[PDB]
DNA sequence: CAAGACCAATCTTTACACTTGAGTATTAAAGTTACCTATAGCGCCAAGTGCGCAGTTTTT
DNA sequence: CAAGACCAATCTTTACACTTGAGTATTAAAGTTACCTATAGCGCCAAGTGCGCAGTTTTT
RNA sequence: GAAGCUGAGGCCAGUUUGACUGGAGGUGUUCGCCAUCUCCCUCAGUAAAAACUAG
RNA sequence: GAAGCUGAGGCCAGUUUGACUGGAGGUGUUCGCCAUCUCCCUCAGUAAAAACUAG
């Protein structure tokens, strides 16, 4: 059964108490004002963060929990979906002999709010929420949307960092997921997508992924809803590709299965951290030099104790990092054990690295008590 | 092996299903057609499209995807070993190399070719069939020669037993003529016809003249090669002709396959649909036994060698069954060479496939494996228990009448070793289960030292739950706090009262609640008190007394063939008041048969019974200070344990509670002499207790919800366990059927 | 810059209106839909049991 | 200028070679194929019957 | 208009009389810093989702 | 390099002191000589296939 949110659904399950006053007084639910949104700057990107105290944050979180998670998606979208992962995004391409990787320029900034309304309309009842002033769908879009004060020209914009932006992006892009999947499959190409990053692989022996025709066709398909291809990130290669560190390799021809491993670039930081821990260089230097984690003096919670606090914090950061990298590598190991697509020698290297990490973690936890 | 993996994406009821680790015998069990027939349809469709047959495409699981994919990985290691060798320069080996293994070894260099040759490598060939939204089909390998050769090397044979034809044996011939590779093409059918008619002729030509007349009369198609070979074989055989008939058909099919495949490199895959249909259980067990005998007689290992034993890989056998007999015999006979597949339904309705552990390292468990153990593989929900009393309680028909939800849960008693090598957690199976155990298996209390000591299973549970000792931080801190409290349980000492019968301040209920809260994630529930301790609670004592009245009033008879003179004589000899106990001992006795007594005798017996009931009530309320002592005495007398978890035998060996033990002994030897045979754990007093209790309360109230409420009040803990199990059953039923 | 290819549902199946046999400007009622769900670790509070709402990698 | 998508047959179906159960560098014989066709209005020749070999439009 | 992309500075080396560019090597390669083997500091600021807690 | 395409000339009209460009109009239109209604001469040279001989 397709999900359908109506006025009673919004009043009881979604609004709860966040917008009780606005729903009893028959006053229109207002836009997310600039007061509730802070603007962080990360490189050339700008991130929008809403305050938790605002009711908009609560309604957005509950919207993610109860409504957006029920709308069906396309199987080629391996990002922000229940059970999806990067390894699942790379896996279907082990059978391919040639690889192509494309990117979408400003995926979240180019999502038109009109497309969002058209996508979410069939799953929301066409009722009037507040008298004959505001519609239910418009109120929900008020919950999910925003106007960037930096760029007032576009008006409604879906910003990165919100509660609901990734899932809404997936739902609005399901249309292009279907179109590109149909095109690639009729061409015999395996297609998958993680956020804005699209990966195609041709298992046959052909130059299709290397020609300009393929890029032209994907750009033509993306142009329907106004997207563009980032030409700086376009990659095409044969028999192996090194996608952001993850290396896929398939030398064979008919009926060959490739292998997914990790390049030395990915292992560089963890190997250096293990070597430094074996070298007995202090935890502060390890955290600062390689991990870029530090305890700023303004972030000291209490002035009762400082040196012991800093030692405990650095130990906590190191234990957390080692646990996290171990978790990442066992994610790789489980992916191998369930799909059987990771290089065997790389599996041996992973096992050795894991044993070293566990020995270092045991040494750290033992030195904690001394 | 033959087939490494089968993967189905977005077809029929499959969302994304991968099957691998195929063993020599693959047993498919689960709820009917929740994906069994869908998997069969997928395999049949793939093998029909392999041979370029025009068959209808399969439907999509969800239309929000453009395509559905079926990927088959063939294990061609043995064929590579077959062909890459220099000796076999035949035409077929050459063609197989040029088709399957070329275009994958051409790209390689010398070093990698040498590495592949010398290493203990495994070679695979992956073929993917993609169905687009407009019914088109695309293969990952565009050469039809590859597809036809793969179909030849790994043929698929499907045997359906329900619609089997006991008189149509055409598949037998189509199978035997293909399996063993005899090259009759070199033997000219012209040369063969002249040859055969030269020989079989009574006069050289006479048979030939007759056949030539026939041929001039009959307009015949040219003989196909398969027809030629079938004619050859079944003429040379000493016989063309051949419930139990279907069994013989299937058994000869399997015998022919296993015997004939030993000399060939063709490794077929055989799928059987309900082999046990229309079979007596012993017949199905004998069918599996015959299959295993054929399998092992042709098996060559480091020990069994000689002419007549081969190392050729065996065909892969799937069969979908609904009978515990087939599964039990497979598991018992095949050991480590079989796999059990469980088919269920996901949240969104898609099919889910799991592998149930059927391999046991304990040979005793393999030998003792029986029908009851193999039945658990079909269970919707399991309630593992520890004693026979639990089985008596949770299987009570009257109790399960009021709770239809719990009627779908199978109660099985499991020892520690049995639980170790059967449980779904170690088998990573999605058959939800709960292990009901007493709190005594973790902590043992010493009255002399007033100290708790920790059982090894508690340490094992702590070690299993302390997986956060090797990982980072998240919201698990409360679990660590609870584990710290569990650690502090050891050092704490607690004082006892009445020489070690009750706890002064401590409530074991709180500790039991904490243990259950912590261990619910490990699927183990720890009941606060024993089952016999759970039935004998302060709230149910009236009904218990009522039950005793019943066993006095209705289940008792007179031990004499002449009731009149007997009852008069013992009324005279023994006083009703001062000697009620010996009078009741002589007059009344428990007996199944109730002979009819006279009106005067019946009235006298009724009066003596009422007097004894009043006396027993008075003495029970007098000898024991409070109702708690009464409950404790009744619990111990039936084999129970105290709040300190001590049995009567334990107290007798240790030597505590002398006064209470002597009081209970006096009661059993004087007043409860008739109930002594029912004091045992295996006496079945639980069944009579529950039956009388439920019947009495049903007499009291006429509403089903109200009767459930009264039962919940009377047995808070047993009903709590039943209700939790029923809620979990409904949740997992919505996980399957919802 | 610039464009053919711009999901799949949305409840579903059947079906004349006007005055009884021919007819020259734009969907729908109705029977079934036909049954759904609050709240999963953390915080508040009774005060330690029970009820209500400081990781890794990838996109970026 | 410059490129992914470079027909469908070609006879077809079956199939191990070596010394009897395991094997680390490249298709084919064979049974059936399994049956096909000269020369259509015009010219030569017997000499007016019979036999042998000066259109339109569209591509352009 | 094709954006290419990055947080702001303070030494030292290379290009500059006075300011700008990098701080393991080997090997191969589709030349991508892409793959494989061996062995600079400070100060800001750091949103969300998803997977993963070997066996 | 993108070929666009046509056979070589001899008057007369339009652009040129001295040689180059066209030889019904109306109407509409995707502006294509595209569609619909009404009403210059000479001389070369001209391969093949296919359809069509109302009913």
UniProtKB/Swiss-Prot annotation, chain A:
KW Transferase (keyword) present: yes
This enzyme's EC code(s): 2.7.7.49
Enzyme class: transferase
Reverse transcriptase domain sequence ranges: 21-248
Matching SUPFAM superfamilies: DNA/RNA polymerases (SSF56672)
Alphabetical UniProt keywords: Antiviral defense, Magnesium, Metal-binding, Nucleotidyltransferase, RNA-binding, RNA-directed DNA polymerase, Transferase
GO BP field: defense response to virus
InterPro entries cross-referenced by the UniProt entry: DNA/RNA_pol_sf, GrpII_Intron_Splice-Mob/Def, Reverse_transcriptase_msDNA, RT_dom
Binding positions for Mg(2+) per the UniProt entry: 103, 196-197
Function, as annotated: Reverse transcriptase (RT) component of antiviral defense system retron Eco8, composed of this RT, the following endonuclease and a non-coding RNA (ncRNA) encoded between them. Expression of retron Eco8 confers protection against bacteriophages T4, T6, T7 and SECphi4, SECphi6 and SECphi18. At multiplicity of infection (MOI) of 0.02 cultures slow growth when infected with SECphi4 but do not collapse, at MOI 2 cultures collapse. Responsible for synthesis of msDNA (a branched molecule with RNA linked by a 2',5'-phosphodiester bond to ssDNA).
Protein family: Belongs to the bacterial reverse transcriptase family.
PANTHER family in the record: NUCLEAR INTRON MATURASE 1, MITOCHONDRIAL-RELATED, RNA-DIRECTED DNA POLYMERASE
Protein name (record): Retron Eco8 reverse transcriptase
Lineage, top ranks: Bacteria, Pseudomonadati, Pseudomonadota, Gammaproteobacteria, Enterobacterales
Gene: ret
Curated annotation (Swiss-Prot), chain B:
Required co-factors: a divalent metal cation
Keywords: Antiviral defense, ATP-binding, Hydrolase, Metal-binding, Nuclease, Nucleotide-binding
Superkingdom classification of source: Bacteria
Cofactor note: Probably binds 2 metal cations.
Chain sites annotated for binding ATP: 33-37
Chain spans, region Toprim domain: 379-692
Binding site for a divalent metal cation 1: 386, 438, 440
Top-level enzyme category: hydrolase
Region listing for ATPase domain C-terminus, in residue ranges: 249-378
PANTHER family xref list: ATP/GTP PHOSPHATASE, ATP_GTP PHOSPHATASE
Protein family membership: Belongs to the class 1 OLD nuclease family.
Assembly with partners or alone: Homodimer.
Protein name: Retron Eco8 OLD nuclease
């Amino acid at each position: 059964k397709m999900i359908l949110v109506d006025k009673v659904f919004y009043e009881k399950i979604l609004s709860v108490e966040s917008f009780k006053e606005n729903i009893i007084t028959q006053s229109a639910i207002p836009k997310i004002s600039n007061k509730e949104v802070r603007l962080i700057s990360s490189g050339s990107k700008i991130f929008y963060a809403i305050n938790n105290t605002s009711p908009h944050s609560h309604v957005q979180l509950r919207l993610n929990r109860f409504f957006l998670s029920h709308i069906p998606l396309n199987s080629a979208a391996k990002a922000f979906v229940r059970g999806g992962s990067y390894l699942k995004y790379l896996e279907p391409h082990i059978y391919g002999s040639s690889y192509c990787r494309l990117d979408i320029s400003s995926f979240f900034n180019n999502i038109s709010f009109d497309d969002v309304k058209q996508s979410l309309s069939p799953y929301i009842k066409d009722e009037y929420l507040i008298g004959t002033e505001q519609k239910l769908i418009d109120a929900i879009l008020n919950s999910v949307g925003y106007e960037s004060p930096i760029r007032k020209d576009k008006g409604m914009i879906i910003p990165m960092g919100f509660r609901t932006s990734p899932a809404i992006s997936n739902i609005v892009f399901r249309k292009m997921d279907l179109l590109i999947q149909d095109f690639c499959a009729k061409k015999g190409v395996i297609y998958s997508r993680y956020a804005d990053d699209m990966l195609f692989s041709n298992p046959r022996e052909s130059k299709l992924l290397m020609s300009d025709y393929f890029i032209d066709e994907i750009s033509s398909l993306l142009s329907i809803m106004g997207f563009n291809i980032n030409q700086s990130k376009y990659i095409s290669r044969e028999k192996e590709i090194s996608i952001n560190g993850y290396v896929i390799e398939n030398k064979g021809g008919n009926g060959s299965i490739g292998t997914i491993r990790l390049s030395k670039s990915k292992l560089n930081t963890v190997l250096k951290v293990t070597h430094a821990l074996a070298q007995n260089i202090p935890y502060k230097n390890i955290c600062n030099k390689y991990i870029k984690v530090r305890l700023k003096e303004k972030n000291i919670k209490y002035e009762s104790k400082k040196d012991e606090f800093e030692k405990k914090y650095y130990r906590d950061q190191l234990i957390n990092y080692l646990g996290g990298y171990r978790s990442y590598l066992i994610s790789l190991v489980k992916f191998h054990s369930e799909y059987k697509c990771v290089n065997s020698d790389f599996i041996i290297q992973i096992n050795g690295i894991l044993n070293d990490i566990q020995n270092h973690i045991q040494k750290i936890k033992k030195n904690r008590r001394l | 092996m033959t087939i490494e993996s089968i993967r189905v994406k977005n077809l029929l009821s499959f969302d994304d299903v991968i099957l691998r680790d195929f063993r020599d015998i693959n047993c498919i069990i689960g709820r009917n057609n929740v994906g069994k027939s869908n998997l069969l349809k997928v395999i049949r469709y793939f093998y029909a499209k392999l041979e370029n047959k025009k068959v209808i495409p399969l439907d999509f699981h969800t239309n929000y995807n453009a395509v559905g994919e079926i990927t088959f990985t063939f294990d061609t290691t043995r064929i590579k070993k077959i062909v890459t060798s220099r000796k076999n320069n035949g035409r077929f080996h050459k063609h197989i190399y040029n088709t399957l293994f070329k275009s994958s070894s051409v790209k390689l260099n010398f070093e990698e070719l040498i590495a592949r040759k010398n290493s203990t490598n495994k070679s695979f060939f992956s073929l993917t069939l993609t169905i687009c939204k407009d019914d088109s089909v695309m293969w990952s390998v565009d050469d039809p020669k590859v597809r036809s050769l793969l179909a030849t090397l790994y043929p698929f044979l499907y045997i359906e037993t329900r619609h089997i034809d006991l008189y149509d044996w055409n598949p037998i011939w189509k199978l035997i003529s293909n399996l063993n590779s005899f090259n009759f093409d070199d033997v000219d059918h012209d040369e063969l016809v002249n040859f055969l008619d030269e020989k079989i002729s009574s006069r050289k030509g006479d048979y030939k003249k007759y056949i030539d007349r026939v041929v001039s009369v009959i307009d015949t198609k040219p003989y196909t090669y398969k027809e030629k070979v079938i004619n050859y074989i079944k003429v040379a055989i000493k016989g063309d002709s051949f419930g139990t008939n279907s069994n013989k058909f299937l058994e000869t099919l399997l015998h022919l396959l296993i015997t004939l495949t030993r000399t060939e490199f063709i490794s077929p895959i055989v799928y059987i649909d309900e082999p046990e249909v229309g079979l007596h259980p012993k017949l199905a067990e004998s069918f599996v036994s015959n299959l295993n005998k054929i399998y092992s007689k042709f098996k060559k290992t480091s020990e069994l060698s000689g002419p007549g034993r081969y190392k050729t890989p065996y065909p892969n056998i799937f069969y979908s069954t609904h009978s515990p007999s087939i599964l039990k015999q497979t598991i018992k006979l095949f050991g480590k060479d079989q796999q059990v597949l469980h088919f269920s339904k996901k949240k969104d309705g898609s099919t889910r496939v799991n592998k149930i552990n059927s391999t046991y390292s304990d040979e005793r468990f393999l030998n003792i494996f029986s029908d009851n153990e193999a039945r658990l593989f079909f269970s919707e929900y399991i309630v593992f228990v520890e004693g026979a009393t639990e089985l008596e309680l949770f299987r009570n028909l009257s109790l399960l009448n009021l709770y239809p939800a719990f009627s779908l849960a199978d109660i099985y008693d499991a020892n520690e070793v049995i639980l170790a090598n059967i449980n779904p957690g170690y088998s990573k199976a999605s058959i939800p289960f709960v292990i009901i155990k007493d709190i005594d298996t973790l902590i043992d209390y010493s009255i002399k030292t007033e100290k708790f000591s920790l059982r090894p299973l508690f340490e094992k549970m702590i070690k299993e739950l302390t997986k956060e000792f090797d990982y980072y931080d998240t919201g698990f801190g409360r679990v660590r706090k609870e584990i710290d409290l569990f650690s502090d349980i050891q050092s704490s000492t607690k004082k006892h009262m009445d020489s070690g019968l009750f706890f002064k301040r401590f409530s074991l209920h709180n500790l039991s609640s904490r243990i259950n809260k912590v261990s619910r994630k490990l699927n183990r529930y720890f009941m606060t008190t024993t089952i016999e301790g759970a039935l004998i609670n302060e709230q149910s004592l009236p009904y218990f007394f009522n039950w005793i009245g019943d066993v006095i009033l209705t289940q008792m008879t007179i031990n004499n063939p002449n009731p009149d003179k007997f009852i008069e004589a013992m009324r005279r000899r023994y006083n009703i008041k001062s000697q009620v106990v010996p009078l009741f001992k002589s007059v009344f006795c428990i007996g199944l048969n109730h002979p009819v007594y006279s009106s005067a005798v019946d009235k006298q017996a009724l009066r003596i019974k009422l007097s004894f009931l009043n006396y027993l009530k008075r003495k029970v309320y007098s000898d024991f200070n409070n109702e708690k002592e009464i409950v404790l005495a009744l619990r111990l007398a039936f084999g129970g344990k105290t709040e300190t978890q001590y049995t009567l035998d334990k107290l007798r060996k240790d030597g505590e509670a002398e006064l209470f033990r002597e009081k209970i002994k006096n009661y059993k030897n004087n007043e409860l002499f008739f109930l002594e045979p029912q004091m045992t754990k295996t006496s079945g007093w639980v069944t009579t207790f529950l039956n009388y209790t439920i019947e009495k309360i049903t007499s009291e109230e006429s509403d089903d919800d109200r009767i459930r409420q009264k039962l919940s009040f009377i047995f808070p803990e047993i009903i709590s366990i039943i209700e939790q199990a029923s809620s979990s059953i409904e949740a997992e039923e919505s996980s399957l059927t919802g």
